[PDB]
Structure formats: structure tokens, C-alpha cells
Design an enzyme around this catalytic site. Structure first.
Site, PDB file in Angstrom:
ATOM      1  N   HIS A  39       0.875  -1.301   0.054  1.00  0.00           N
ATOM      2  CA  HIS A  39      -0.036   0.028  -0.143  1.00  0.00           C
ATOM      3  C   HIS A  39       0.876   1.312  -0.064  1.00  0.00           C
ATOM      4  CE1 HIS A  39      -0.084   0.112   4.763  1.00  0.00           C
ATOM      5  NE2 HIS A  39       0.259   1.268   4.308  1.00  0.00           N
ATOM      6  N   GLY A 138       2.968  10.066  12.955  1.00  0.00           N
ATOM      7  CA  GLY A 138       3.895   9.976  11.920  1.00  0.00           C
ATOM      8  C   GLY A 138       4.530   8.492  11.978  1.00  0.00           C
ATOM      9  N   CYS A 140       5.796   5.152  10.316  1.00  0.00           N
ATOM     10  CA  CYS A 140       6.225   4.649   9.241  1.00  0.00           C
ATOM     11  C   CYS A 140       6.063   2.907   9.214  1.00  0.00           C
ATOM     12  CB  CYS A 140       7.680   5.298   8.513  1.00  0.00           C
ATOM     13  SG  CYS A 140       8.733   5.802  10.308  1.00  0.00           S
TER      14      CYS A 140
END
Lengths: 296, 296
Positions: A39, A138, A140
Site C-alpha cells: 500500500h 508519524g 512509518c
């Protein structure tokens, strides 16, 4: 007594940042291949109903910015392997440890190297829930692992947050844990339960560490305990679970069924404002194997 | 939301096993020097009343078996630096990271790389208690650290378990945290307290993560809160603590004194069998800086 992860050094050397469009997330660089969630190619809008084969054709090798620490790796191939993006780079990782891909089971624990603010940032220990979720801005992403003697067993890569805040991901072959898919839809998790075997294991750890008040002089049975367990949304105990707790039972001198009787009491009577290992809750994220590994 | 340590890779490359007599424990190999607790030279009997200068004279370079992973380092000098043993080896560590020695403060958190079964084995996050202890068999000791940008800040080395199960150690210059000495005697710890600033910080984290029930529409004052804090063995709040919580107060829109009012309520009224971030206890091992670093 504390929840501790495996040292993360060997996994840190494999962590890269994979950028595609505005999406930046974490990859695993082993030999000459980088793995990340597929994705990464999706805009936060393709996610609703993604045709991944179609979206990938639109991508080329230059669509992917792969950064190992502060070296940009040149990507020389891309393909899809289940729910993973498989990226071929021009350099094989000189910090590739001995590693295996294992698919862990519900109730089993693993360490997570979490990517935050665009790099490997944190490390913590967790358990795969019986309903195949993870309780792990945030972000990752993140890599799950155990260290099995000389070898890193990679077991998890984070893919998704579900609308309830629980996480879903795959093993390192790209196959989701549980019934989940990488699509932003109304995926409800199964009803979660407490990992009984782990709770007993942690109770044994408490006894090892001096907490004894919860011990009583009754025993129980698998059939009786499981009725109580059903009621309190705990996992049923099997004979396998009992045999697993053998070494801890011998160490403490408390027969597994005696400890079940202590647990049964704790579920029905609460803790009356007392603590076990500084905790007022019953902890289920330590396996018998984690307890054995810590004491000692 | 989870308690997470710094990735331990850079510290793992510095960890060695120092053996003297029957005592084996962990050392830190930086450049051409290995640091470990000086009580490695003591038999579990010298510990009662050790004259360290006297015991060290009896030792030579060959008394020390230093093992970096599976390389035996040749020790070419030994000396005492406060409560640390300073060992000079013939090879400087090629995995020496950029590092500083920092002495942390009570209430401040750090990551620990724990040595178990004769090697680096586990990693966890902890806080230095206001009474200068650590809530952290086959223990070979442990190293405390933070990662401050590109640099490892070493802040702790484990030395002793006190008769109550709490741990004492030094900074990396060899100076004990708190009033403790490396001697097996009746050293009682100061009465511990809960780190208020951290509890407020974690409450802000709860609000960030969706838990809001504990919020009320009263405010308090430093003088009023500190009476309640005194009663519940919490640390007094200072204006420094309030200014520190500024960024989190702005992020959430909840003024620090409003959050103190929520905390005051929680101490006097309990939690009525509710949870904050899956916890029924008030957590004090996250600083404002840890909360900021996680979200986000």
C-alpha cells in the site's frame, strides 16, 4: 519483573525507508531485496478500493525512493508477493543477519522495531492477540521479530490501523494474520480474549519473584476452569497448555491446576486493591518461554 | 500507546563479558577501555565489607577475562575510577559509536540493555526513581542509555540489588545515583514517590489517544495540588514542571492546571474500575519528552 524486547541491533541494520509518492514507510532490506507493505503505492484514497495489480503497472523502478540510513539504494526491480511489495536493489545488504521467516501463532509474543518520524525509533514487546490483532501522528510502520539463538525470526510487518485503533499486518511472506485485507473498509476484528496460558505463566513469575498472596489451597479441573474462562472472555485451557507450564510448575512446586484455582479465584473475587508484580491487572503478554528466559 | 525503549544496536556493539574469579558480568567497551562494576573482583563474601584498593592490588591483568561476543580481548591495564573498574585492552572497539557520558536526574527515563545468561539479552524502558533507585537468577548486569540525535548518552550501569529488590548503580563515571555504596549492608532506600510530571504527561498522551473521561471542568493551583500530592506521596509540582508541559497543553487545549484538577480528582476518587490507556494504575515512567517523541 519487566516486559522486555529482544535487542534490536540485527534488525536495525535491515531497516530502510521506502518512499512512493507522498507515502514514506519502513522496509526490510535482506540481501538484495527490500520488503514493505504494498500500500506504499496507494494514495490515501486508492485505499478505499485498491486494485493493486492495476496500480503497480503504473509504477516503475524510479517511483520508489529506498533509503538505507543515509544511502539511497538504486531499485532495479519491483513485484508483488502477496500483500508485500518486493523491491530488487543493486546492492545486497552487508548487514544481513542470519534470518528465517516464521509465521507466529495467536498468544505468541514478539519484539517490534517501530519506525517513527521517518526512521527506526523505538523497540517494545507484544503478543499476537487471539483475534489476530496487535496493540502497538508519524508512523512509518514496524517489523516484528524474535531472536532464536543465532538467527533472527521475522514474524510481522505492520500494514494497517483498523477504525478501532488495533493494528493488522502480515508475516514476512506477505500473508495477513487473521481475516484482514489491506483495504480501508469496515473490517471488524473478532472479539478479543485474554491469553490464559500467558496469565498463568506470569503468575508463576510472580511466585518466583515473591508475590504469593493469591495462592490458595484448592485445585480445579479443565472442565470447571473453562466455564469460568468462557464467562470472563479468557481462552480455554487445553492439556497442551498444562504440559507447557510443566517446568514452571516444577520450579515453584505449584501444580498447574492449583495455579488455575488461584486464577479462578482472582477472576471471581478480583484483587481487592492488591498487586501482582506491581500490577493491578492480570498480564497476558508473557509466554511461559518469556518467563523461563527471564528467571533465568 | 506503549512503553518503548531506544533501539539498542549501537550499545550492543559495546557490550562485553568481564570475568574475574567466578563472577561474570557485563562491561562497556568504548575505544580501548572496558568499564564494569568494580565488585567483579569481589567474592560474594568480600561484599560484606570490601577494601577495594586492597583487593585490586591482589589482581593482575590476567585476572580478567574480557569477551567481546566471541573474541577474547587481551587486557593490558587495570585501574579503579570511582565505583567502576577501568580495564585497558590491546584493541580499540571498531563499533564504538559517538557517545557521551550523562548523569541523568530523578524522574528522567532511559533505556536499558540487560545482560542475562551471560550476554546482552533484553531491552526495556525505565525511569530513575525520585529516591534514586531503579525497578529493573543469572543477571550479568545492564547498561542504561538514551539516544540523543546521532549520539549515545550513557547514563547508567547496574551494580547492586538492595534487600528490597530495588536496584542501585552508577553513571558511567562510576558515581552512584543516590546515597548508595557498593557494599552488601543494610542500605535502606529513601521513601519513593510518584513522578507527578510524568503522570500528567501520560494523561496528555491519553487525551491524544482518545481517553477523555477523566477530564473535568475545574482547575486547581500549585499550592492546593501539592497538599493532595503530599498526602498521596506524589512529587510536588513546580512552575518548571508546568512550563515543561506547555507544548502538550497547547496540543490538547487543556491547560496544565486543568489537567492537575483531573489528576487531583483521580487520586481522591480513584478510577471507579475504569482505564486510562488500558491501565487501571497511574503511570509515571513517561516524561513529557517521551510522549512528544511518540505522538509524534
Amino acid at each position: 519483573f519487566r516486559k522486555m524486547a529482544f535487542p534490536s541491533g540485527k534488525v536495525e541494520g535491515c531497516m530502510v525507508q521506502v518512499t512512493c509518492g507522498t507515502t514514506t514507510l519502513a522496509g526490510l532490506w535482506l540481501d538484495d531485496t527490500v520488503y514493505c507493505p504494498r500500500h506504499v503505492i496507494c494514495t490515501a484514497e486508492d485505499m478505499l478500493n485498491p486494485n493493486y495489480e492495476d496500480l503497480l503497472i503504473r509504477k516503475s523502478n524510479h517511483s520508489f525512493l529506498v533509503q538505507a540510513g543515509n544511502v539511497q539504494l538504486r531499485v532495479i526491480g519491483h513485484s508483488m508477493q502477496n500483500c508485500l511489495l518486493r523491491l530488487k536493489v543493486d546492492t545486497s545488504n552487508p548487514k544481513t543477519p542470519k534470518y528465517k521467516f516464521v509465521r507466529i501463532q495467536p498468544g505468541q509474543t514478539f519484539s517490534v522495531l517501530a519506525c517513527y518520524n521517518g526512521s527506526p525509533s523505538g523497540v517494545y514487546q507484544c503478543a499476537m492477540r487471539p483475534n489476530h490483532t496487535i496493540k502497538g501522528n508519524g508512523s512509518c510502520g514496524s517489523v516484528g521479530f524474535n531472536i532464536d539463538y543465532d538467527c533472527v525470526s521475522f514474524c510481522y510487518m505492520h500494514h494497517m490501523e483498523l477504525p478501532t485503533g488495533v493494528h493488522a499486518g502480515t508475516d514476512l511472506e506477505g500473508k495477513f494474520y487473521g481475516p484482514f485485507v489491506d483495504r480501508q473498509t469496515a473490517q471488524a476484528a473478532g472479539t478479543d480474549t485474554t491469553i490464559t496460558l500467558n496469565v498463568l505463566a506470569w503468575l508463576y513469575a510472580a511466585v518466583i519473584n515473591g508475590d504469593r498472596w493469591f495462592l490458595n489451597r484448592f485445585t480445579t479441573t479443565l472442565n470447571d476452569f473453562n466455564l469460568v474462562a468462557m464467562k470472563y472472555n479468557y481462552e480455554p485451557l487445553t492439556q497442551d497448555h498444562v504440559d507447557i507450564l510443566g517446568p514452571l510448575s516444577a520450579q515453584t512446586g505449584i501444580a498447574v491446576l492449583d495455579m488455575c484455582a488461584a486464577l479462578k479465584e482472582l477472576l471471581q473475587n478480583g484483587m481487592n486493591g492488591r498487586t501482582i508484580l506491581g500490577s493491578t491487572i492480570l498480564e497476558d503478554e508473557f509466554t511461559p518461554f518469556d518467563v523461563v528466559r527471564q528467571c533465568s
